[model samples]
Every structure is written in structure tokens, then in C-alpha cells.
Target: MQPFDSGHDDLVHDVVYDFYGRHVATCSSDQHIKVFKLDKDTSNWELSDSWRAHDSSIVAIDWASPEYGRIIASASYDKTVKLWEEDPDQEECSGRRWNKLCTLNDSKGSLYSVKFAPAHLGLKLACLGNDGILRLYDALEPSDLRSWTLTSEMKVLSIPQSDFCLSWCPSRFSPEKLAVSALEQAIIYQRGKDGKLHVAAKLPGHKSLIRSISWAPSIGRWYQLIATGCKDGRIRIFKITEKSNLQVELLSEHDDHNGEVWSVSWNLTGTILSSAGDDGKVRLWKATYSNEFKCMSVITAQQ
Candidate 1:
């Protein structure tokens, strides 16, 4: 939660925790991806290493595998999603140095978001942006993996351009659930008897653009829920009630920002939710005993 010097001239674009939550990676308008330590003993993290992630502004970033530790992926307006590595010797990866792994780009549009799929099921990445096309890539080096191949690619879809905001669920093969948040609706690409991306149901909640969607950690077989935030300035909750039906619920919302809400995420414990917006602020909301989401605090960068 504390920021040291990133040594960048522009605003930080995106930041994410590693799968194990021991560290964090950040992207900035300066087009670099910087890693930081987040252990309790550390007050402020020193600059570990940075990669020349893109030619243009780096917009989104995600860690590929916590088990692997060194796989970093990022997307940029340079129309590419690039990968980097820390190397066998960790010393080669810090203090503004990294080995470029590979790059995925779409000739038609600029990139905005990238996420490596959950590791236990697959070594794939799902990415999308201005082109309105969902592009998939193999995140693992083929030589190191037997079940998955390297450089394998696919397109989940091509849809109309809404805002650059989008959210994706991990591959559903594990829980028989995969979802994507786009435009004003949430689509659950459920796995059916045939084992394909079956369109289970289209759930509606947001009145304007849907900016983000996050699947909370599961407690049991009955725990399938998604929270979405958007231009309506609200975080809406939807759950799978039946195999074919989606029930909508409004969790909680606030109106302190200037424009649309941009992102929403759940903590590892599933007890807290964090959201951000065009107003350049991040707010934390806590889930209460009555299944209500209560706003806890807000963080804004004041000039």
C-alpha cells in the first residue's frame, strides 16, 4: 500500500499482486514494469527491477505464475502484450533490467488488458482491448511444459467497442465456471457436457458501461458469485442461482468520483472489495455480516 520512487515521470497505470501475495508488479504511463517487495518487515519497497515493457504506455499487467515467480506479462498501447523474465540469477532482473521473453500484438488495435490464465489448469493468457477482439496466448515455454504448447493462440471473440474496461474470469475447467464482463452485461462461458465455452446465461445489472468483474474466492459448492462495477457508479452482484438462470443483486455503491468506475477487485479473504475510477481514487469496501458491502475507506492522489 506504500509507494516508493518508481522513478517514472507519468502516472502508474496498473498494479497487481503476485499469486502468492508476497510481492507486487506495476505498470506506468512511462512504459515500464516495476516489481516491489510487500513483506511486513519492509516499510517501503526498493526498486527491484524494471523492464522496457512497451514502446507506448503500458496499461495493464499480470503475474503468470507464483510457483515460477519470474514470469511477468504486460500490455500497452504500443499494440502489444509483452513478456519478461528474471533469469536464473535473480541479480540480472533488478535495478532496471529484465530479459524480454516474447510479444503478442494485434495489427488492428491497441492493447489495453492482459491476464495469464490460472496455472493449475492451463498456461494460457487472455487479452483484449481497442480492437474489441479477445486474443489468447500460451504463457509457458513449450519445452518446460508437456500438457500445453508454446505460442498456441486463439480468439475468444470480437465485439463492438465499448469502453476500454473489461474483466475476465479464470478458465472454468476447475469449477465448471468461466465468466467475462463486457459492455453492460456479464457472460458466463460455462462448461457443458460437450466441454466447450458454452454460453450459459447473459446477466444484466449495470445501466452504463461495465468496467470490471471479479470472482470471489469460493467457500464451497454453493459459492459462485461475481461483482461488477461500472459507469453507473455502482458495484452490482450476480450469482448463479440455477444452471440456466442468473439472479441480480445490488451490493453497495458510492458517488465520490467524477466519471465512471473503472475497476473492482476482491481481497484474497473475500472479505473486502477495492474499486477505482476516472476520478483517480481507490476505495475499499468491506462485506458485512448481513451480506452487505460497506465502504470502508478511500485513497486518492492529491496534487
Candidate 2:
């Protein structure tokens, strides 16, 4: 990997690429945020800009699409979520301008994750926190990021949950659906005809804390796949199918990680999955021989 000098003094928590993969934004424990732009000719990444984004560690970052015009959201341990927009008029990498548009500070606890809703849903975002609250914010005026309104606030767990993650279903064909992992269970929430979020189903197989969860984008399939990473060192894949009754089936369980699994993500086509864990190994899994998911590659950072 070519190094694009990150000036962060502490651990970098997460890095998120924009929708077109042209730029990436990173958040860090140093309470700072940085954006990098990819150079096509040299295959190098240039530091586009950097800023002190939070009073505490910045834990997560997500970039909204061009439809929202070069915007990004960051969640921090300071109990606030801040939105930033790239100044299109500033083209110089060293002098690139990133303007702070809005800050969302109504969360009860440390913010854990921030994600933009599917582009089909307009300019919207979902923020989750340790207080077990999931909040939905929408930009009432498309071009005005500062003119956001809190549209929904739902208590996901009655008690405080230290760990929680969520992913929205990308298929417009399906009802607006999102899967959230918290308190050892993965709960699916669906946007109903009433325009409110309702519990659709819950998959309760994980015995310990869940670390991460992801919902695969539907690709002309009868069922949508969901993957979860658990502290029990296992990855579980579930198939949600709509039949006579909505059904949730455990498609497969894999114990490839000797330590806690930290993350699980699917490819664009939903054909392959990549998982990483505390063991410092990332494994790529695919359905091959015998139609069983198997690790196709294992890359370890321990030397």
C-alpha cells in the first residue's frame, strides 16, 4: 500500500470510501479527520485535506454520494456527529477546503456509528449510540446540510448496549429495511406502510457480544443475506426470505477466527465475503466446491 501521510497522532479507527471510490475519509483517536483523493495516473493517493473534527476520538466516518455533493459524516466519542462538505471551488490538495456544515449532539452517549441512507431515500442519515438509541436525520432542503431535521428517534435496546452496528438493505424493491446487531442478537427493522420503523424479525443465535453486522444488497435473489461477527469467534450468515411468512434461516456458521471476529463485509455482487478479527488475519470466503462457503485466502499482518 502506498502511504498517503496521515498526520494523526493516535490510532485510526475507520476509513470510508466515497460512493464512486474516488476519495476516502478517515477518522482517528487523535480527534482528527482527513480526506484523500486518488490519482488515476500515478496510482497514488494524495492528502486532500485534514481537520480537527472532534473534542474526543473520532470513531467512525461515512461519505454521502455526489447527489448530496461531496459530503461526509463523522461520529465521535465526544457524543457528537459532525457533517463536512468539500468546497468544490478549492482544487489544491494542500489548500483543499472542507467546511463544517452541521453538528448533531443530541445523542445520550458516545456515538458508535454513522451511515448515510441509500441514495434512493434522498439525503438521510442514521446515527447509533451506546445509549441504545437509533436516530434518523433528514435534510429537509436537498442542498442545505445545515437544515436537517430529526425525523425519527427509536430506542433500540431498553438498556445500554456498549456495542452496536447497523446496515441498511440496498434493494429498492424491498421495503426500506435495516439490520441492527446489539445485545447478542441481530434485529431486522422494516419501514412499514405507516412510515415508521417496526421490528420485522430477530435472529438470536450469537451467545456473546456482536461486533459487526452487514446486509448484502439484493441482486435479483429471492433472499437477502446478512452476516454477523461475534465475540465468540464465529461468523454467522442468515438468509431472509419472504414466503408465505417472512422467514429467517441460518444459512451457515463458520469458525475460522481463533479470536473475536471484528468485522464482516460482502462484495458488491454479494458473491463473496471478507472477515477480519482480533487475530490480525483477514479471510476471504466464497461458495465453491460442494456449494459450501470456504476460505479462499488468508492474509495475516502478524510477522
Candidate 1: what lDDT?
Answer: 0.66
**Superposed model 1: Cα runs more than 4 Å off:** 1-3, 39-42, 88-97, 139-142, 145-162, 165-177, 242-259, 278-282, 288-290, 296-303
Q: How many pairs collide in each candidate, listed in order?
A: 0, 0
Alpha carbon lDDT at 201, candidate 1: 66
lDDT of 2 by residue, 1-303 (tens): 845667679999888888878888989999988888888997888788887889998998898878778889999999999998888776655444788899999897998888888888888898888888888899978966788899888888867635778788888678787888776867888887789988889887898889988888777576888899999999988889977345888877888897889999888878889899989999998876544678889988888
Alpha carbon lDDT of each predicted model: 0.66, 0.84
How far out, in Å, is residue 36 in model 1? 1.6
TM per prediction:
0.80, 0.93
Candidate 1 lDDT over 89-139, as tens digits, reads 557345545667666655367776777766664566666666666555663
Model 2 residue pairs with clashes: none
